[PDB]
Amino acid sequence: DEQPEPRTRRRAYLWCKEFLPGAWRGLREDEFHISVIRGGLSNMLFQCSLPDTTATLGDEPRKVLLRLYGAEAMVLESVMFAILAERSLGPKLYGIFPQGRLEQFIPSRRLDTEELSLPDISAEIAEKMATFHGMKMPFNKEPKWLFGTMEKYLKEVLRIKFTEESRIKKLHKLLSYNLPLELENLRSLLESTPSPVVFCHNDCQEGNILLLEGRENSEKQKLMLIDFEYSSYNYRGFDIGNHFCEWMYDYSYEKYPFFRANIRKYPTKKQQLHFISSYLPAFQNDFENLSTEEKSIIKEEMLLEVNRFALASHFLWGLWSIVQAKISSIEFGYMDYAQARFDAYFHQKRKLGV
Ligand SMILES: CN(C)c1cc[n+](Cc2ccc(CCCCc3ccc(Cn4cnc5c(N)ncnc54)cc3)cc2)cc1
């Protein structure tokens, strides 16, 4: 288990000792256990724990996750995390301070891309998302996030000047589509596509879904959605369409560009209907008491809705990725990823006949 540098060890020890109750309060520095869960320059994660020989005094956790930010948004993100914790839809919040958070450590692993298509996994994600979508949050209810964000990235993308030859050639090719005009065409399409405004996760990818340890038996209760940093009131179609897009991207791929894209992994009509068939009863509650006529019309229109909004997933994350090619320190093939998203966008446009 990778040890942090002595300084980070000492800081982590002091936060745990001061924010956590019970046996943590009298812990000595020499008794403190910590290891790295994820390095990097931002959102460093560590597991912190009591010695195995140390007894708890009450209901304090034996193990916690320390999240360190590194290099209004903090207020919103913080309040949102605390509310989800109170409602048991996220990890408990044990401590909050300018440099990070102490969270409940959830014994689990992330799902892999291939698991998204498993019937039981997909059905639970649908149910979890419908729950997420149904609740009240003290945030702006106007759906300006989607196009406001897309405009913001496009404005930045148009200003970008690369110096390295590969990035230069790639940006040229992406620019050749006339993105401002394409954004306008997308805007018009989505304007004519009704979709309820709900509290969306906005990044429901496999890496943000935990498979809970000790619960492979549980058909319906084995997942937790995490990482709500992008969450906002947004069109329901975006959340679902974005999730469907994520079937096609595997970020665990070990060589450059550090992802694999496969267009044929997008869910089939059957797979899509299985997802929405689980979503709709969880979101509407009495949905199954409607006529087969009405149920089918709702389902068919919803397929249209989410598949059109999947275009915005491609366009938004495509633009985002170009910006990250300029600003991010992370080892990821951002320009290659942007091209993959735009390739999918035009493919999806062709499939839809739009
Ligand atoms: C915005 N989009 C569409 C992107 C963004 C980034 N990428 C590239 C990329 C995606 C995913 C990854 C892997 C993400 C790792 C994040 C992570 C780390 C640890 C965990 C485990 N975890 C989190 N909280 C807890 C917890 N509280 N308890 C136990 N385990 C936990 C979950 C998720 C790396 C690069 C692609 C598309």
Query: Are β-strands 63-70 and 93-97 bridged in parallel, bridged antiparallel, or unpaired?
Result: unpaired
What's the CA dihedral at 258, 263, 268, 272 to 10 degrees?
50
Strand partners, 42: 70
Asked if 100 and 215 sit in the same domain, the reply is: no
Nearest atom in ligand 1 to the alpha carbon of residue 205 is 3
For ligand 1, atom 10, name the residue with the nearest CA: 251
How far apart (Å, rounded) are the C-alpha atoms in residues 83 and 291? 37
Asked if 255 and 154 sit in the same domain, the reply is: yes
Scan for tokens 């709500």, then name that residue.
228
Among the residues of the chain, which ranges form H helices? 6-19, 73-86, 119-134, 145-157, 165-175, 179-191, 236-246, 269-284, 292-327, 334-352
Q: Is the dihedral of CA 115, 264, 246, 187 positive or negative?
A: negative
Asked if 282 and 231 sit in the same domain, the reply is: yes
How far apart (Å, rounded) are the C-alpha atoms in residues 101 and 94? 7
> Which of 36, 37, 43, 200 has most ligand 1 atoms within 8 Å of its beta carbon, as the pocket-test mutant?
37
Asked if 191 and 234 sit in the same domain, the reply is: yes
Residue 113 carries which DSSP code? G
Q: Is 43 in the pocket of ligand 1 (CB under 6 A)?
A: no
Asked if 189 and 85 sit in the same domain, the reply is: yes
How far is the centre of ligand 1, averaged over its atoms, from the C-alpha of 171 (Å)?
A: 27
Q: Which domain holds residue 33?
A: 1-70+92-105
> Which of 251, 256, 341 has most ligand 1 atoms within 8 Å of its beta carbon, as the pocket-test mutant?
251
Burial per residue of 320-350, b for 16 or more beta-carbon CB atoms within 10 angstroms, e otherwise: bbbbbbbeeeeebbbbbbbbbbbebbeebbe
Q: Is 253 in the pocket of ligand 1 (CB under 6 A)?
A: no
> Among 77, 59, 69, which Cα is nearest to 21's?
59
Asked if 211 and 328 sit in the same domain, the reply is: yes
Q: Is 63 in the pocket of ligand 1 (CB under 6 A)?
A: no
How far apart (Å, rounded) are the C-alpha atoms in residues 282 and 272? 16
Q: What is the CATH number of the domain that holds 316?
A: 3.90.1200.10
Q: Is 92 in the pocket of ligand 1 (CB under 6 A)?
A: no
> Among 220, 206, 224, 222, which Cα is nearest to 282's?
220
Asked if 111 and 47 sit in the same domain, the reply is: no
How far is the centre of ligand 1, averaged over its atoms, from the C-alpha of 296 (Å)?
A: 36
- Of 46, 79, 105, the one marking the end of a domain is 105
Radius of gyration, alpha carbons of the chain: 22
Asked if 10 and 85 sit in the same domain, the reply is: no
How far is the centre of ligand 1, averaged over its atoms, from the C-alpha of 199 (Å)?
A: 20
Q: Quote the Cα angle for 233-235-237, to 5°.
A: 140
How far is the centre of ligand 1, averaged over its atoms, from the C-alpha of 46 (Å)?
A: 14
Q: Is 38 in the pocket of ligand 1 (CB under 6 A)?
A: yes
> Among 132, 143, 105, 335, which Cα is nearest to 234's?
143
Q: Is 106 in the pocket of ligand 1 (CB under 6 A)?
A: yes
- Cα distances from 72 to residues 76, 78, 100, 139, 143, in angstroms, run 6, 10, 16, 12, 18
How far is the centre of ligand 1, averaged over its atoms, from the C-alpha of 226 (Å)?
A: 9
Cβ neighbour number for residue 258 with a 10 Å cutoff: 17
Q: For the chain, how many residues are written?
A: 354
Q: How was this structure determined?
A: X-ray
Q: Do residues 322 and 157 touch, judged by C-beta distance below 8 A?
A: yes
- The residues near 237 (Cβ < 8 Å, ≥ 6 apart) are 193, 195, 305, 306, 308, 309
The answer on whether 343 is annotated among ligand-binding residues is no
How far is the centre of ligand 1, averaged over its atoms, from the C-alpha of 14 (Å)?
A: 26
State whether residue 253 is helix, strand or coil. coil
43: left (phi over 0), alpha (psi -120 to 50) or beta: left
- Cα distances from 131 to residues 2, 39, 81, 286, in angstroms, run 37, 32, 16, 15
Q: Is 108 in the pocket of ligand 1 (CB under 6 A)?
A: yes
90: left (phi over 0), alpha (psi -120 to 50) or beta: beta
Asked if 141 and 20 sit in the same domain, the reply is: no
What are the backbone angles phi and psi of residue 353, rounded to the nearest 5°?
65, 40
Which helix (DSSP H) or strand (DSSP E) does residue 46 occupy? Answer: strand 42-49
The answer on whether 42 is annotated among ligand-binding residues is yes
Q: What is the CATH number of the domain that holds 32?
A: 3.30.200.20
Q: Do residues 187 and 147 touch, judged by C-beta distance below 8 A?
A: yes
Number of compact structural domains in the chain: 2
Q: Is 332 in the pocket of ligand 1 (CB under 6 A)?
A: yes
Asked if 142 and 21 sit in the same domain, the reply is: no
Asked if 52 and 81 sit in the same domain, the reply is: no
DSSP string, 114-170: GGGGSHHHHHHHHHHHHHHHHS--SS--S--HHHHHHHHHHHHHTT----SHHHHHH
Asked if 115 and 173 sit in the same domain, the reply is: yes
The answer on whether 208 is annotated among ligand-binding residues is no
**Helices 292-327 and 165-175, interaxial angle, to 10°?**
140
> Among 138, 134, 148, which Cα is nearest to 75's?
138
